[model samples]
Target chain A: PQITLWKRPLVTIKIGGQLKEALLDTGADDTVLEEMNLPGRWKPKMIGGIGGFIKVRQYDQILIEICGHKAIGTVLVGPTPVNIIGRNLLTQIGCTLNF
Target chain B: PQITLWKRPLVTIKIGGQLKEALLDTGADDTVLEEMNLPGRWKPKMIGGIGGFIKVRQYDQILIEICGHKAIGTVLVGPTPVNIIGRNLLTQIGCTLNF
Candidate 1:
């Protein structure tokens, strides 16, 4: 499917056995989701963005079903205002930016 | 042009007579640039993102040449770590997300 830039490209995603919606962000380098609990060990990491930097928990080898397409990657859990499907997961699902 | 999500979709943009590189962000609602001087009256505005919210100066009717394509829209100036060409300008350039 082709999504126009007239609105935010939010899509349905399944993670941690829960359904969630995330923005398909081409600008973000990593996938950052709203604070949530996931199984396994996670490392504390810091990521910088528009306003400044923030601390997050990095969980690797996470399985996320993006728009019904399964993708496995590292998902950063933090206090983000919105869930973002960044380049990491996007590449796995073969997402592209076109004009 | 078709840009893969394997890397950040950064592009060159000419604004305020200066050539700068910016990320083509599909998730961002408005265009935000690093602190710079622009000619005209601007109002104070607040925008939120992954990290948090920030205060910025909004300049309307701004002419920006993105990848050689001219686009006129409101640009926000603030202390952003990186210049972002958000949906507001992406629409003018006919940018879209494809999978």
Candidate 2:
């Protein structure tokens, strides 16, 4: 399937049964979402980015939908300014950089 | 050409005639590098992310070479912990996310 690289390139995603808009960030190693509730056991983790490092909730076996493509992977919940869809989930949908 | 997304997905790139290894960040909108001196007229801008926002130098007509692909665009220089190659230059090379 082909994906359009919109000018700003934001996408519709469903996470943990909730529909949300997220930035498709290829730069991030892990998926980080604004603080949320999840039904699972997760360990404490910290991910770093542009500004600095922030603590996050790492949830395992979380299902995510990117452009109607589905996959199950780890989702990090934390004090994020925006929801970021990282490579971990991007690959599940066969997503790649394109012209 | 198809670009392989490495497990850790790091790539070799050249910016302003200097070669360096940078993360292929699909997450970042602007390409940012550690402090560098470039000859050009630029403006000060602020970009935000996970931890927070910081001041940066936005230089236009900057040349960037990623995996032998060359493009000229806006390059931001600041006190970034790591050098990041964002979407601005990614599309110039016809690169995309692939499984």
Candidate 3:
């Protein structure tokens, strides 16, 4: 798929057997999801961004389907305003920026 | 230019006659730069992200050179950890996400 930057690149995604929407955020270092419960144990971690840092729970090897593409990586569950699919998962799905 | 998602897509940019580095952030709606002074009058605005919201100054019709490609658009000046070239400017540069 080729996504133009004319608008917010929001895409439907499936995670943890639920359908959701996420932004393909190239600026973010790690994939972050709004507060959610997962099965495995997660380590408490902090992530910094435009405003400041926020504490989050890191879940590894989580399966996620972005626009029909499947990927597994570290996903951070936290208090983000929106779900962001960052470089960690983007790379696994072979996403790239072309101009 | 083609940027792979294997790493952070940081690129050198020239803005307001100064050279700086910025991340080509697809997730961001607007370009936000670190504290900088511009010639024109700017309106006060706020932007929200993973952590929270921050006040910013919106400067319109700013000329920026991203990786040697010239583009003009709105640029927000604020307290960001890193400079970001968002969709507003990315679209001007004909940037797209291809997989």
Candidate with the greatest lDDT versus the true structure: 3
**DockQ of candidate 2, scored on C-alphas against the true complex (2 decimals):** 0.56
What DockQ results do all the predictions give, each relative to the true complex? 0.84, 0.56, 0.89
lDDT of 2 by residue, B13-59 (tens): 88767888887776678889999898788899999988899999999
Point to the candidate with the largest TM-score.
3
TM-score of each: 0.96, 0.89, 0.97
**Candidate 3 residue pairs that clash:** none
Q: By DockQ, is 1 or 3 better?
A: 3
Q: List, residue by residue over A1-99, the lDDT tens digit for candidate 2.
A: 454332545788887678999887777778888888988799999887778889999998898888788889999999998888887887777776654
Q: Give me the TM-scores for chain A across all models, comma-separated.
A: 0.98, 0.90, 0.97
Candidate 1: deviation at residue A17, Å? 1.2
Worst 10 residues of 3 chain A by lDDT: A33-42
- Candidate number of the best DockQ: 3
Candidate 1 displacement at residue B4 in angstroms: 1.2
For candidate 1, lDDT tens digit of each residue in B1-99? 888978788889999789999999998899999989999999999998766789999999999999999999999999888899999999999988888
lDDT of 1 at A74: 96
TM-score sort, best first:
3, 1, 2
